[PDB]
Amino acid sequence: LDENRNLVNMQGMQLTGYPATGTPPTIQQGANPAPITIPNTLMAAKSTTTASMQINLNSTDPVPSKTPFSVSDADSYNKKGTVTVYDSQGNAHDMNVYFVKTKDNEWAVYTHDSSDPAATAPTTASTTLKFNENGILESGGTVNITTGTINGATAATFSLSFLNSMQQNTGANNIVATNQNGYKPGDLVSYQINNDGTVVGN
Amino acid sequence: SMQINLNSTDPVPSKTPFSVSDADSYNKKGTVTVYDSQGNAHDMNVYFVKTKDNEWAVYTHDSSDPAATAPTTASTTLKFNENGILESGGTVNITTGTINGATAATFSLSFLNSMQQNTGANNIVATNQNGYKPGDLVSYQINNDGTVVGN
Amino acid sequence: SFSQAVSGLNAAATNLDVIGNNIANSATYGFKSGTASFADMFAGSKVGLGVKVAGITQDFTDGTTTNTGRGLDVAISQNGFFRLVDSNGSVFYSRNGQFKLDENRNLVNMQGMQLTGYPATGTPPTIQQGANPAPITIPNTLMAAKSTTTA
Amino acid sequence: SFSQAVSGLNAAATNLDVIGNNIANSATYGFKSGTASFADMFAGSKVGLGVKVAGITQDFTDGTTTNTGRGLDVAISQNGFFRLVDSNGSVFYSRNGQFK
Amino acid sequence: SFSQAVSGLNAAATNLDVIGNNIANSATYGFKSGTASFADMFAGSKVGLG
Amino acid sequence: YSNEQEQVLGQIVLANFANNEGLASQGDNVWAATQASGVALLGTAGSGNFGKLTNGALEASNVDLSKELVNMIVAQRNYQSNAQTIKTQDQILNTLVNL
Amino acid sequence: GKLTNGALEASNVDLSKELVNMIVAQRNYQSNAQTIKTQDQILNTLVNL
Amino acid sequence: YSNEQEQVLGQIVLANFANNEGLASQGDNVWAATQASGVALLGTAGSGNF
Amino acid sequence: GKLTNGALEASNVDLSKELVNMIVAQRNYQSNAQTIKTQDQILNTLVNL
């Protein structure tokens, strides 16, 4: 690895290969080979556009006792989960998702941003998950969610998904999977060459 | 040139106004060593103070000049867009002080490619300048492309 | 026609010298082994004119960390290089962490090269992570007292 | 060529002499161990001319304190050195506390 | 190579010295026993030096 | 200090390079940055792209004696093979001159 | 530091460390001797041409 | 000296030439300055081109 | 310097450092003999013309 960040041999000839273009970068094989370079260029942040939360629900859960909803009161809801998303500047938004059982196989989910101190607590249903005769999610698996505006950064709106969520006689409500496509800025830590020839920077 | 990365989560310093002695009065301090006409080294200190989200006042001082006036006015203002990219205020013409009668150097300090996002903390990515001091011949070489270079 | 045999003998001698040097510096804290890299020198004809040494490549893999114990001793893990300056201001880098304080109380290694770093200034002193690196000193002067201003 | 191996042998011999001095001095009140520090001798060429002994560093770690029952025997805990004078007035410093 | 066994021997010697010191203070009012804590020394390679 | 208070005198700076193989060794276990190695990137231990510092310890050399001895054997054999080639050319030239 | 009366500061030489270092040093010395032997054979080969 | 004070007596000078190859060897591991090598530049060790 | 009674100053010849120098000087001597032989063959091929 020379001073200009190119992969060269002992004599200085530059190694060539298919370059990566786009966001997220992928190898475009339709282009002519170009010298391979490894810049330190900090990686910018990606505001979230798609988030997913797969969860399993208990059938035997009783309905919340203390109507109405309060984000402060624990006994006011059945479950609470946290998903970390990222805005245009990479700031962390901690979406708390609240599960309240309304009727049989019907679960209202509320969304509240806890990272923004001036955000109002939701009072109306964000979505109503409907589970069929046996866990099988029926409707309401996808909802548009808008972040708060924190420290002048652009609020990131995204589609949050509950696909493949199930509601059966599970012992308790616990989160199975949470994923999101956003990330915060990062600096180059390492580089490697895979057995398929791809150069990957971590 | 000074490429820096700033954190968007930094609180505004409490101690107004900015004071060089007061560490609590500014967010970040950096140093760049420039050279005047004769060759004396001027350690220009650049101070970044956050005022409002997407706004950073920048002050400059000369740490090599004992007679340099205390900075009381903001030298410039960096404004970053909602995506964290610098929009305006990235270039400013700055003049150093006079040491032992040497002519002060007026140079353009540029904060190009500086970005404000959610990093770990305020870190200076790179600093550079095109001035230097007197140099004596140490070695010579002939490179691969035939160019003769003296170090 | 010894064009090839002489070059091969020279390359073998260079490789053997590199191996012997690696053997000799086996107990040199901060030493990295070296390996010669060879290349052929075909020139117009297909007869294979000879061989040449394209260079000597270091092996910058971290060595075993041995707790000698002496406090000043500092071992470095992963990437990084200790920064030193000689008496003439030139900048050098070393992985050897065997340091001592000289008579002027300046952190130096066995060869007297002054260890550098970010100095501290002010009252109380703060690490000037921006200030250009300076030689580190450990003065023995008595520490003054600060009048109580906040309790 | 020969110089690199000669320097390596000399450095190994110096290390072994330091080890022998330490091991012969295992029973010596106030003695401090020694360790040889080596440095390479690159000069212009990348071939690595050899190694050299940069110096011998003492290890001033406070040793175990052993009682003897003599009133003139005193040991320096932590840092500090006994100051002594010879016949000519020259000054010297020693950690050994056996006085008569 | 040798460094691994050297580190192991030094750790064993430290443990032996700690045990001997604890035994020597079997009758020492207000004394609290000591125990050495060990940790591996992996560095880059998967060999796990010492 | 003795007044139940401490001071900070300095912070050791670390250097990282784009090209480790480009550093030219000047001897005395010391490296110098040149054109091929690029400019030194300065920082602190444990932050950015720098490893932390171990106190009371020294980093030994990464020279394994077994590999060095085996490579010495192989290089000796290669040197003797090249010497045999030289002898072959010597005999060829002697044969031609004796004509 | 303070002074303790009626006692002496013993040496800080730990014997096991010295023995292990001696073993390492001797082996290093033997490796360098092997290097000298190899270069001696090289010079003999070149002379006997 | 014996009075616990050192005194300097002189400094060794180093000479560098524009053309080292032009020096006329006089034997006894000794070189002499000539017109081809040019006038010797004097200085101190560790500074400039010394 | 000081005088120590009941003691003798031994020689300062280290055998290891000497044997190595003996090997090196042997090689130098053999190289010079090889040069002599080369000049001898030079004179031979000139004479036999």
Cα gap C86→C114, rounded to integer Å: 6
CA distance F88 to chain D (A): 25
Residue appearing with tokens 């009072």: A123
How do B55-62 and B41-50 pair as beta strands? Answer: antiparallel
I16 three-state secondary structure: helix
CA distance G46 to chain F (A): 6
- The residue of chain F nearest to residue D50, with distances taken between CA atoms, is F27
How do C99-101 and C107-109 pair as beta strands? Answer: antiparallel
Cα gap C137→C120, rounded to integer Å: 10
**A147 CB-contact burial (10 Å; exposed 0-12 / middle 13-18 / buried 19+):** buried
Cα gap A124→A141, rounded to integer Å: 17
Residues of A in contact with C34 (CB under 8 A): none
Helix axes G15-47, F65-97, angle to 10 degrees: 10
Q: Do G12 and D59 touch, CB atoms closer than 8 A?
A: yes
Closest CA to F74 of D12, C35, C39, E2: C35
**Touching pair C, B by Cβ (3+ pairs < 8 Å):** yes
Contact F48 A5 (CB under 8 A): no
Q: How far is CA A182 from CA A48, C104, D90, in A?
A: 4, 54, 75
**Chains in contact with A via at least 3 Cβ–Cβ pairs below 8 Å:** B, C, F
Contact E45 C61 (CB under 8 A): yes
For B84-104, b/e burial (b = at least 16 CB within 10 A) is bebeebbebebebbebeeeee
Residue B45 is inside which H or E element, if any? strand B41-50
- The residue of chain C nearest to residue G17, with distances taken between CA atoms, is C68
Cα gap G25→G3, rounded to integer Å: 38
G18 three-state secondary structure: helix
CA angle B61, B63, C127 (to 5 degrees): 100
Helix axes I15-47, D2-24, angle to 10 degrees: 160
In DSSP terms, A143 is beta-bridged to A160
The tokens for E48 are: 């796990």
Residue appearing with tokens 């690895």: A1
Contact C16 F21 (CB under 8 A): no
Residues of E in contact with G16 (CB under 8 A): 9-10, 13
Cβ of F62 under 8 Å from any chain D Cβ?
no
Closest CA to B21 of C121, A120, F93: C121
Cα gap A92→A84, rounded to integer Å: 6
Q: How far is CA C137 from CA A102, A112, D76, F11, in A?
A: 70, 54, 27, 11
Tally of CB atoms within 10 A around C46: 6
| Strand residue runs (E) in D1-100 | 33-40, 51-59, 65-67, 74-76, 82-85, 91-94
CA distance D43 to chain I (A): 23
From B21, B31, B124, residue closest to C131, measured CB to CB: B31
Residues of E in contact with C64 (CB under 8 A): 3-4, 7, 41, 43, 49-50
Q: Do A114 and A94 touch, CB atoms closer than 8 A?
A: yes
- The residue of chain B nearest to residue A92, with distances taken between CA atoms, is B118
Residue appearing with tokens 């979230």: A48
**C117 CB-contact burial (10 Å; exposed 0-12 / middle 13-18 / buried 19+):** buried
The tokens for C58 are: 């270091």
Closest CA to C109 of C85, C91, C133, C90: C85
Contact C23 G35 (CB under 8 A): yes
The tokens for G7 are: 């006692």
| Strand residue runs (E) in H1-50 | 14-16, 24-27, 30-32, 41-43
Residue appearing with tokens 């940790």: E39
Query: What's the distance, CA F13 to chain centroid?
Result: 22
The tokens for F71 are: 């490579």
| First-to-final CA distance of chain D | 56
Resolution, expressed in angstroms to one decimal: 4.1
**Chains in contact with G via at least 3 Cβ–Cβ pairs below 8 Å:** C, D, E, F, I
Contact G1 D25 (CB under 8 A): no
Cβ of C79 under 8 Å from any chain E Cβ?
no
The tokens for D18 are: 């330091």
Q: How far is CA D25 from CA A106, B18, D36, D92, G18, in A?
A: 84, 63, 16, 20, 11
Residues of D in contact with F29 (CB under 8 A): 39-40
Residues of C in contact with F70 (CB under 8 A): none
**Chains in contact with B via at least 3 Cβ–Cβ pairs below 8 Å:** A, C, H
Residue appearing with tokens 């040197």: F79
Closest CA to F53 of F63, F44, F65: F44
Q: Do A58 and A170 touch, CB atoms closer than 8 A?
A: yes
Residues of E in contact with F64 (CB under 8 A): 1
**Backbone dihedral angles phi then psi of residue B86, each to the nearest 5 degrees:** -65, 135
Q: How far is CA C63 from CA B109, C123, D23, E1, in A?
A: 43, 40, 27, 11
From C13, C31, C68, residue closest to D40, measured CB to CB: C31
Q: Do A148 and A88 touch, CB atoms closer than 8 A?
A: no
From C62, C78, C138, residue closest to F9, measured CB to CB: C138
Q: Do A34 and A7 touch, CB atoms closer than 8 A?
A: no
**Backbone dihedral angles phi then psi of residue G39, each to the nearest 5 degrees:** -70, -30
From G25, G31, G42, residue closest to C23, measured CB to CB: G31
Contact D75 G3 (CB under 8 A): yes
Closest CA to C24 of A127, D5, B87: D5
Cα gap A191→A199, rounded to integer Å: 7
Q: Where are the alpha helices (DSSP H) in chain B?
A: none
Torsion of CA D41, D42, D48, D51, to 10 degrees: 10
Contact I24 D13 (CB under 8 A): no
Cα gap H24→H39, rounded to integer Å: 13
Q: SS3 letters for A62-88?
A: CCCCCCCCCCCCHHHCCEEEEEEEECC
Query: What's the distance, CA F65 to chain centroid?
Result: 15
How do B86-88 and B76-80 pair as beta strands? Answer: antiparallel
How do B123-127 and B28-35 pair as beta strands? Answer: unpaired
Cα gap A183→C9, rounded to integer Å: 56
Cα gap C124→H9, rounded to integer Å: 46
Closest CA to A81 of A64, A100, A67: A100
Residues with Cβ within 8 Å of residue E19, at least 6 apart in sequence: none
Query: Which DSSP string do the residues of C104-119 spell out, in sequence order?
Result: T-BEEETT-PEEEEEE
**Backbone dihedral angles phi then psi of residue D56, each to the nearest 5 degrees:** -120, 120
Q: How far is CA D47 from CA A201, C11, C70, F72, in A?
A: 33, 12, 32, 15
Selected residue of C6, C22, C23 to mutate for chain G interface (largest G Cβ count, 10 A): C23
Cβ of D46 under 8 Å from any chain C Cβ?
yes
In DSSP terms, B141 is beta-bridged to B149
**Chains in contact with F via at least 3 Cβ–Cβ pairs below 8 Å:** A, C, D, E, G
CA distance E24 to chain C (A): 25
CA distance E3 to chain F (A): 9
Cβ of G26 under 8 Å from any chain D Cβ?
yes
From G36, G40, G47, residue closest to I34, measured CB to CB: G47
Residues of B in contact with H49 (CB under 8 A): 136-139
**Chains in contact with C via at least 3 Cβ–Cβ pairs below 8 Å:** A, B, D, E, F, G, H
Q: Do A188 and A155 touch, CB atoms closer than 8 A?
A: no
Closest CA to C90 of D39, F38, H48: H48
| First-to-final CA distance of chain B | 24
**B2 CB-contact burial (10 Å; exposed 0-12 / middle 13-18 / buried 19+):** buried
Q: Where are the alpha helices (DSSP H) in F1-99?
A: 65-97
Contact E1 F60 (CB under 8 A): no
Contact F22 A187 (CB under 8 A): no
Q: Do C117 and C83 touch, CB atoms closer than 8 A?
A: yes
